[PDB]
Write a protein that binds this ligand. Structure first.
Ligand SMILES: Nc1ncnc2c1ncn2[C@@H]1O[C@H](COP(=O)(O)CP(=O)(O)OP(=O)(O)O)[C@@H](O)[C@H]1O
Ligand SMILES: Nc1ncnc2c1ncn2[C@@H]1O[C@H](COP(=O)(O)CP(=O)(O)OP(=O)(O)O)[C@@H](O)[C@H]1O
Lengths: 401, 401
C-alpha cells in the first residue's frame, strides 16, 4: 500500500487538478494520493477564494485520499522553503513518490540540473564570491554563476513557475535524504488554469468556467457563496491591512516578516494615500521586491507575523505537526496504518496539541474570515476549532460528520 | 479681551449647547467663547458621530468663538483626568471664566463640597482604611467614608454625571489654584439630550430632531452622511475590534491601557464568540468595570494605546500643546492677543510640531475613518494635515476657506 504525494494550493480544484491526481496514482503506481495543501493564504501571498474546509471537501470526492494542511509557516514563502516544508510533510507521511507538474512529462531534466547544482554548489558559491567583488549585485552575481554550468540547453526552464517548484521539490528530497521518488507530467473537457477560473467567479459569473470544473467543486463553491456570502479576494482585506499599518510603529513594522531593512518607511507613506490594494501595491513595488514577494509581506503584515518568531519555526528540520483536514476511507486506512509511525503529532481537532506554528495557522484563519459579514463571520470562526477532519466515503457520497 | 472656557463634546451640537454658549458669554461677561472639545473619540468612550472638523462648524455658528481639540489623552479618560487636562488647557489660553451645565444649577454645593472635602481629606482615608482593613471593597469603603460627610439635605447627587464633571472641573480649578471663575446652570425649537438625539438618528430619524437641533448643526450633519455615507457608531468599528484582537497575544493585550491584569484572557475568548459588539460587552462585564470603562477600554484596544504610552504622558501637570480646530472673528482676535503667552506650542498646521500625545491624536484620526468606504476614506484622511484651521465670519455667515 503505497502513497503518492502532491503539493497543492487547489485555488480552486478544477479538472486540471483532476488530471493531476489520477495521473499521479496511475504513473507512480500508488493506490493512495496524499495532498499537502496551503490553507488560507497561499505561496504568492494571497488569500484562498474559499475555505480550506470547502476545498478539502472538493478534493476528497475528486480522487484525493488525504488532505493535510501545509502550515502557514511554510505556505507563504518562496518556492525553496515552500518545497522544504511540504516535502517534509510528505516525507513524514511515507509517500513513496512526489508528483509535480511542469510543461514537460519528463522527470529527467529536473534530476539532471539538481545534481549539477548540488555538486557544483561549491563551484557555484565560490563563483558568486568573485562576482560581488567585481561590483555586481547578488542576484546578478548569482545569474552569472548559474550561466557557466547551466547555459547548456538541457533545457530546464526556470521561468515557467511550476517547473521552479519541481526543482525545489527535487532539491528538498535530495538534501533531506528522503526515500521519495519524484515523478512529473506535462500540465494541460480541455482544461483551464486555476487563475483564470478565479477571475470568473470574481466577476460574479461562475457560469463561464463550469466544464473546466468537476461537479462537486461547483456545488461546494456555490455552497460557500451561499453559506458565507462571498468569494474571497485580496481586496477584501485592504481595510484590515489599512488598520494594521495604522496601529503599528515603524520600529514595530521593521520586525514584521519580509519587511526588509528600511522599507517600513516606504510602506507607511504609501498606505495612507492608497485607496485600493492595487494602488498600494503600485506605490510599493521596487526592484528589490517582486509583486508576489510584496503580497507575501503584506500578508505577514496582515497576520502581524514577526521575523524572530518566524526564524524560530523555520529552524525546525521537520514539520512541527501533521494537520488533518480530511480523509477518505482509504486515507483514513493509510493513516491508521502509518499513524503509529508518525514522529510529530497528528492533529484532527485543534485541542489535540499545542505548537507555535499552529497558533499561526489559527491566527491566519481568524484574519481570513473578517470579510464575512457578521454574524456569518462568527459562525465561520467556530470551524477551525470545531471542524474535525472531513470524512468522505468513495462508495459514493458518504460524509460522516 | 475676555474669554469663558467651555469643556464640551458636541455630539452633535444641540439646542442645549446653543443656549449654553449664549448664556456663557452672557453670565460670564466674556466677549469670547473658547471650547475645548474631544476630537474623534470621546469621554463616554464612543466615536464622534461626525469628524471634529464638522462638529467645529456647528459650534462656530452657534456662538463658540474658539475651538481647541481635547487630546485623546485627556478626552478618552475617567472624569477625574478628563477634567484636569481640559481645565488645564482653558487656563493656558487664560480663560478667566468657566461655564458648565449640570443637574444642579447651583455652584455653591459644588464649591462647598470641594471646599468641604479637602477640609476633611485626612478624615476620609482613615475611615476608608478603617473600612478597608475591615475588608470593604474600594468603592464601598469610599462610599462609606464619603458618606461620613456631605450626606446632608443638600442633594447635589454626584451620582449624576453632570455634577460629577462639574465638581471635577471645580476641583481641578481649586486644587490647581487657577484664577478662573467657574459657573453653572441647570439643564432644561425644543430641547432633548444629545443621546436621545443620537439614538433617534440611529433610528433612521433626523428631521425629527430638528426641534432639538439648531440649523447649522442640522445642516452640518446631513452633509457628512452625504459625503462619507455614514454616522459613526461604536458597533461600526466591531470588525476592526475583532481584527485587532485577532492578532494580539495575551501579554501584548495586557499592556493596553485600561486592560486590567488577567482580563486579557476573557477579552480574547469573548471576542471570538461575539457576533455583536453588544454581545461582546455582556461577556466582558465585571464589577470592577463600569460600562463606559469597558467602552473606553475598547477604544484603546482599537488605537493600540499602551499603558506606558498613556501613563508616561498622563504624568505632566501641563498640556503638551494647543491644537486650534477653528475660530470666529472674535476667536482670532483672542488668539492673537494671547498668542505670545502660550507656554506650549500652538499647533495649526500639524506639520509645525510633533509630539507623542499629538502622535496619538493622529492615530485616533486614522482609526476614525476606517468604517468609511473608499475612495472617500483616503480623502477623509487628508483632513488631519492639509486642512487649514477653519475660520468663520461672525457677522453674516462666511467661512473664509
Ligand atoms: N492541467 C494540469 N495538468 C497537469 N498538472 C496540473 C494541471 N493543473 C494543475 N496541475 C498540478 O497540480 C499541482 C497543484 O496545482 P496548484 O498549484 O493547486 C494549481 P496551478 O496549476 O499552480 O495554478 P495556475 O495554473 O494558476 O498556476 C501542481 O503540481 C500542478 O502541476
Ligand atoms: N440643555 C442643557 N442645559 C444645561 N446644560 C447643558 C444642556 N446641554 C448641554 N449642557 C452642558 O453643556 C456641556 C457640554 O456638554 P457635552 O459634553 O458637549 C454633551 P452632554 O451635555 O454630556 O450631553 P447632554 O446634553 O445630552 O447631557 C455639559 O457640561 C452639559 O452639562
Amino acid at each position: 500500500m503505497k502513497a503518492v504525494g502532491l503539493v497543492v494550493e487547489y485555488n480552486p480544484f478544477h479538472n486540471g487538478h483532476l488530471y493531476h491526481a489520477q495521473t499521479a496514482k496511475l504513473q507512480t503506481g500508488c493506490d493512495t494520493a496524499v495532498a499537502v495543501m496551503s490553507g488560507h493564504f497561499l505561496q504568492r501571498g494571497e488569500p484562498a477564494v474559499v475555505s480550506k474546509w470547502a476545498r478539502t471537501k472538493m478534493a476528497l470526492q475528486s480522487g484525493v485520499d488525504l488532505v493535510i494542511e501545509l502550515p502557514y509557516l511554510y505556505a507563504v514563502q518562496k518556492a525553496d522553503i515552500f518545497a522544504r516544508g511540504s516535502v517534509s510533510i510528505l516525507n513524514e507521511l511515507e509517500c513513496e513518490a512526489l508528483f509535480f507538474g511542469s510543461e514537460n512529462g519528463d522527470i529527467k531534466p529536473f534530476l539532471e540540473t539538481a545534481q549539477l547544482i548540488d555538486e557544483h554548489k561549491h563551484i557555484l558559491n565560490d563563483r558568486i564570491k568573485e562576482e560581488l567583488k567585481k561590483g555586481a549585485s547578488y542576484p546578478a552575481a548569482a545569474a552569472i554563476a548559474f550561466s557557466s554550468i547551466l547555459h547548456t540547453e538541457s533545457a530546464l526552464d526556470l521561468s515557467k513557475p511550476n517547473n521552479i517548484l519541481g526543482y525545489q521539490y527535487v532539491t528538498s528530497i535530495l538534501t533531506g535524504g528522503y526515500p521519495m521518488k519524484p515523478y512529473t507530467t506535462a500540465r494541460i473537457n480541455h482544461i483551464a488554469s486555476a487563475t483564470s477560473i478565479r477571475k470568473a467567479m470574481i466577476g460574479q459569473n461562475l457560469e463561464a468556467c463550469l466544464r473546466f470544473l468537476p461537479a462537486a467543486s461547483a456545488r461546494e463553491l456555490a455552497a460557500y457563496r451561499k453559506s458565507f456570502g462571498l468569494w474571497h479576494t485580496p481586496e477584501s482585506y485592504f481595510s484590515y491591512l489599512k488598520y494594521s499599518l495604522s496601529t503599528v510603529t515603524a520600529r514595530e513594522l521593521q520586525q514584521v516578516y519580509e519587511v526588509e531593512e528600511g522599507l517600513e518607511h516606504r510602506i507607511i507613506r504609501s498606505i495612507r494615500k492608497s485607496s485600493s490594494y492595487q494602488e498600494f501595491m503600485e506605490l510599493l513595488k521596487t526592484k528589490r521586491y517582486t509583486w508576489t514577494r510584496l503580497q507575501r509581506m503584506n500578508t505577514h503584515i496582515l497576520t502581524r507575523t514577526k521575523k524572530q518568531d518566524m526564524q524560530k519555526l523555520l529552524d525546525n528540520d521537520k514539520a512541527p505537526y501533521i494537520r488533518l483536514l480530511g480523509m477518505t476511507k482509504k486515507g483514513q486506512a493509510y493513516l491508521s496504518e502509518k499513524k503509529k509511525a508518525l514522529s510529530v503529532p497528528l492533529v484532527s481537532k485543534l485541542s489535540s496539541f499545542s505548537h507555535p506554528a499552529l497558533d499561526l495557522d489559527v491566527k491566519a484563519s481568524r484574519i481570513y474570515s473578517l470579510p464575512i459579514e457578521e454574524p456569518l463571520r462568527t459562525e465561520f470562526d467556530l470551524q477551525e476549532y470545531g471542524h474535525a477532519p472531513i470524512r468522505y466515503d468513495e462508495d459514493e457520497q458518504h460524509f460522516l460528520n
